[PDB]
Symmetry: D2
Amino acid sequence: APAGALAAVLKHSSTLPPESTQVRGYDFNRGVNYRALLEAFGTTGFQATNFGRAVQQVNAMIEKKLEPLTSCTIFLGYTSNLISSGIRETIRYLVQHNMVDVLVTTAGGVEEDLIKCLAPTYLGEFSLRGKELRENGINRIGNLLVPNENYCKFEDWLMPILDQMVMEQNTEGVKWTPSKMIARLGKEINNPESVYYWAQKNHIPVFSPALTDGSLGDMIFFHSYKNPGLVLDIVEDLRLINTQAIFAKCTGMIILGGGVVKHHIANANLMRNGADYAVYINTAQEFDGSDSGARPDEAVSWGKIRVDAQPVKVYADASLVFPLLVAETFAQKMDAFMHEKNED
Amino acid sequence: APAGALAAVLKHSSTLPPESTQVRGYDFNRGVNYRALLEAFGTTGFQATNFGRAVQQVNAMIEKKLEPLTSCTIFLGYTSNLISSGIRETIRYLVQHNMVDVLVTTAGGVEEDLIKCLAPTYLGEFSLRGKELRENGINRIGNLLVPNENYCKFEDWLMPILDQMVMEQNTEGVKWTPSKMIARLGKEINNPESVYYWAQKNHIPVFSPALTDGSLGDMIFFHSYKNPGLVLDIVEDLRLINTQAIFAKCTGMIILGGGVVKHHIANANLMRNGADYAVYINTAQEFDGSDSGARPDEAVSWGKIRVDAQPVKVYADASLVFPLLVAETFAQKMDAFMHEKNED
Amino acid sequence: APAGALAAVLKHSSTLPPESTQVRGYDFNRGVNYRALLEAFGTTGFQATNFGRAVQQVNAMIEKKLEPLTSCTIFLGYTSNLISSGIRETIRYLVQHNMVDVLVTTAGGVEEDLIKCLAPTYLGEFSLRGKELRENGINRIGNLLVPNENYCKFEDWLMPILDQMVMEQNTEGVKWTPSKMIARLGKEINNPESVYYWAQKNHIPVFSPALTDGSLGDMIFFHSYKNPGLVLDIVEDLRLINTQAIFAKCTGMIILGGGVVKHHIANANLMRNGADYAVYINTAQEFDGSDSGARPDEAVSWGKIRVDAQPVKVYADASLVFPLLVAETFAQKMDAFMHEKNED
Amino acid sequence: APAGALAAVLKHSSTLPPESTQVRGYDFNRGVNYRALLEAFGTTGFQATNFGRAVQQVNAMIEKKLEPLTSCTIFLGYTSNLISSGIRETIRYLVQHNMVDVLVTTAGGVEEDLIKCLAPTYLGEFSLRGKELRENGINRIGNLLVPNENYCKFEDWLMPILDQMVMEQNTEGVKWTPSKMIARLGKEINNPESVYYWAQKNHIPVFSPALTDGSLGDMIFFHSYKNPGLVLDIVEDLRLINTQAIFAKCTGMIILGGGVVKHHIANANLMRNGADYAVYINTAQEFDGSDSGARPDEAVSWGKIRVDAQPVKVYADASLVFPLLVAETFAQKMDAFMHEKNED
Ligand SMILES: NC(=O)c1ccc[n+]([C@@H]2O[C@H](COP(=O)([O-])OP(=O)(O)OC[C@H]3O[C@@H](n4cnc5c(N)ncnc54)[C@H](O)[C@@H]3O)[C@@H](O)[C@H]2O)c1
Ligand SMILES: NC(=O)c1ccc[n+]([C@@H]2O[C@H](COP(=O)([O-])OP(=O)(O)OC[C@H]3O[C@@H](n4cnc5c(N)ncnc54)[C@H](O)[C@@H]3O)[C@@H](O)[C@H]2O)c1
Ligand SMILES: NC(=O)c1ccc[n+]([C@@H]2O[C@H](COP(=O)([O-])OP(=O)(O)OC[C@H]3O[C@@H](n4cnc5c(N)ncnc54)[C@H](O)[C@@H]3O)[C@@H](O)[C@H]2O)c1
Ligand SMILES: NC(=O)c1ccc[n+]([C@@H]2O[C@H](COP(=O)([O-])OP(=O)(O)OC[C@H]3O[C@@H](n4cnc5c(N)ncnc54)[C@H](O)[C@@H]3O)[C@@H](O)[C@H]2O)c1
């Protein structure tokens, strides 16, 4: 056998350092111990390991937070479609129990939470044809379906509130911004199944710079014809979110998906020289030079994440991962949260 | 041989209809005929075919447009990172020659165009480490590098303009919105290498609902301390873009990337019951239920694209595809555009 | 407000049919009921729903199978890297308990199972640099590390077996094929942590057409110098796998990843006019025209999946999903499997 | 304005080194200079830059090669679907002009080249439904269509050759392997539109370890019933490809797609301690720990690519990129290749 070929393939190696963790997956011969099965992800490799790490990093934020400012200001960001999904329940739970501090989502993430209190979203298929669906008035979101009548009901619900908002603006001197509007819609919906009803109740601000990009915008638009004048200033909202990071004793970022939501939270944290913790769960890739697909390490170069931080990105659809992440972090600490509220 | 196995594999088929196009790639034995090579993409299959179709659909918008309203209002949308890239040149060219009608980009897409007139962006590597880059003040965007001193120069340039903007607001009664601001920055830069200098010159509105999500926002934020009061209303901008679609004789959508940009243009077109043409070039996928990754057919179900339209999505990085698309469409019709301006 | 704009956005819709399932996510207010949490995935949307469906379809195969042929011949296919990961444990479990009938993996999927009995694989990072790793003799697989000394130990272990294999070929008249070789390596390893030790014990054939593409191949190659003559015929293996599908009373396909593995199983099932069940968990996409990324519906057009079947593809990294899928299917039916073996 | 916020955002940076290349895209004001437009990709950023680099690295292999061994042994690997596409023409061109040295493709990549000489492949749509297509006997490959009658014609063509192959094996003592078989099919087809007709003519070996995974396999399978005995040994083929790398004065790897093809070529090059050049064009991603999606740097850690080499991966669909890459490399050097053949 050729010497050079042998030497290249049979290259010797020393042993790995003692601290080295072995790849080992869950052993079903033990039966189904879910907690152990979930912890086993950490040593399974690839994204499972990243999920194992995410759990560890979210638990660090929490522990830190449990040490009105708190010991750690957690920013929760999520894309609109995630509110279209069942993750709406997951998010509402965190908000309901005051487990997070700031929320940021896109227009869809706001409106669809309120509309779900008016009518449901249904399961459909990615393959459903647009033409046939349009002829029936059915809007498709992935493999989900939103009957257009939901938006017609949304209008009936929203319009009178918009009458009042423009009224307050012009007589009571109210300066509306996306966050202020969202807090108002949340109080109006007055439904415990709503994320914004709880955010409003627990004084958790919700930022959404492009609140006009969706149904709410459609309604504001049509309403402006009979009632012009409504102003939504995004500048004051910039101030609000930014000072939230600046005056934080410590920060953690939990971001599902990318886009404006991901960037907005990271930019707020740049104001304090970087977030202390960061866990992302998104499907975007770096190859196209996009922000959405950028690895956390890129954020480090900008100063958005502390150089000493240990950000974690799980490359996966958050509809499958977020509830598992919550099961092993926030849901395990319920009693701990209640404790700080003097309820346990 | 088993009868059932044979029947299943050797299933007979009739011939395909006459109109059937054969898969055939460019034959280099002809030498390098670029135009023929590019047209050959249409019969190459996969995304090449989609590129072939995109060329056909963009040429349809144009031809239609060449029949102040025009015969076809073209909406050009692109993500921020694409302005970070060399596609800035491509986009400026279209805008400079009044080849498109409405532009929509995110905060980064605005600011980075102006900053590139102050200092350049450099080539780097995706692999460059955040820590080391941060210690040197270098911001990483994909495999591109933006020295932080660019932003320090941006501040020096921008601040005095912001002084004037708040001044005009409070004495001249100016109501600022993202589009109005962008048009002003474009006039101020006063540089032919700028996309917004030309947009401003050719009266092409630029919408960006979340203009606060970036450096401009950073600057507005800091500036608000010495000079509070600046208001950026996104509502009037909703009206402007929406009526652009509503009063269009016909519309075409050319969108690079996804996010707010993609959704905002499609929602404006919903106002007229759908765009007549739509060509997208983005890397997003549908599996996660995201808007960005949604196939054009999903837009059809919403009414954003006409049922009779023939939208085309090229799954590719637009930095590699957009200049080819422009070479075969807009760039081939230069004389035709000049003609309508009475210059040829 | 413009009539046409209103009509387009406020389009009425009838209600969805009664059979319509509402999107609803798990409610953590119930505490952490893992089983309920996992079932809730079905109504969460996007890939979670696809996971919910996958569970249903894998449970259908099983139930059917529990009605030497069995009532349903299950083909389990997986890529090499999945054996590098902790999914090696998951796969061994299924094989150990005779829960599946045919296995198909690539060269890496075979060799790395045996080597893990000689030395472990470690956790590393995707970011680890090739140069530095090579200078230390460490091979990188994703965020996993395989010290090259593992392969040096592999050689010491394998060589004497190869001496015997060529010997048997030439004196005992043995006709070697990948499956026969794999069964032999499995008996030789004689370790209960091995997938192939169990496959061999439970008479579960393992197909791997390109068994030469890896370390085993490296070793066969070097060994052929001192001992030429070894022949690995892939034709007889084609016959074996094909008749497995042809003479099956019913078939189900569980495929993790794509490539040869995915195609080989689907082609075997074409021999019986299609698989009755098919569940895939892979990250590939259709846009590039690849087999790996092809949706199950494409397989239907070929006759690889029955038109009446209900294939399910979960777009996700199987290291995170496969153990959950096993927890809710095979692991829930342990007693049922033991029953058919007259052990419960 | 908060001092800490200012300092974090307005962090100063020194200038980048002189050797720093500025991001600048093609300027269409110059008109359409295709060559310049293509070179401009190098400074456009993201994958365009990677394409610019790919061109540079493929031109380096060539130049080196132009200095029966040659000064650089180029391995060309491509997935099956790429032969289904128009890239079949591109590949045949390189092979026809003896521009590459070794080819490696999967079963589909072999058979579909031959079948295209019997009947064409057509353009279809990714959206075409499997059921309806199956009822008509039409096989779908991405947005391409292969009427099943093509395979029925394939059988008529192939069978008599298989009769002869088994005959030669048993009387003439021929030891068949995938490469030997492919060379024979190539001579039999006797058509200049065929990749394998030319490979056979120019003595360019074609490796395909899993040649049984497709139609050829289907035919071998059925044929084995009337004529059993055919043996396809993959071991000798391992030797052939491996020594090709071992005895090369220098090597370059051009790989389209991933899977067995990509790994097989890289493993052959490990035998000489690594390839000197490597250019990949594939859509796979690293997150799932797959080989296909592994960055070239991972190959460096294994010793498959020389530490001093400069591998390049273009993240894109090769149907759109490969013809451009060929236009700027091989096609520009036609006269140079003819020269070494004493024809110019
Ligand atoms: N339901 C909807 O999708 C909906 C409804 C109304 C309006 N809109 C508008 O669309 C625009 C764009 O939407 P967006 O900014 O929320 O993001 P998006 O939906 O466009 O997604 C941005 C990125 O987030 C990631 N992502 C999405 N879903 C994910 C998931 N399930 N798991 C992991 N990663 C995921 C993807 O990588 C994607 O590239 C917004 O302005 C929004 O208001 C969307
Ligand atoms: N240069 C930057 O990336 C930059 C700079 C400053 C601020 N920001 C902010 O980041 C936020 C998100 O950025 P965004 O909304 O512009 O989008 P994004 O960069 O987050 O990308 C959204 C989607 O567009 C697609 N995409 C991106 N590049 C593409 C390309 N090269 N070719 C084809 N498809 C492509 C991807 O699929 C991605 O999922 C914005 O609010 C923005 O202002 C970004
Ligand atoms: N550990 C290794 O990666 C390894 C080791 C030795 C040899 N090899 C060789 O590499 C060649 C290619 O490997 P392969 O055919 O096994 O496939 P691959 O690893 O190249 O992957 C093929 C496709 O499977 C999918 N996939 C991979 N991991 C997945 C996961 N974690 N979850 C969901 N989907 C996933 C991806 O979509 C990918 O496009 C083979 O011939 C093999 O023997 C690989
Ligand atoms: N036409 C076909 O697809 C076809 C036909 C018959 C048999 N098969 C069989 O399918 C099995 C798998 O096919 P394969 O190994 O050739 O690979 P594949 O088609 O499964 O693809 C493997 C990886 O290559 C990449 N890839 C594919 N097309 C690409 C492109 N257009 N541009 C850039 N990257 C691309 C993808 O990332 C994919 O993950 C093989 O054994 C093969 O014989 C395929």
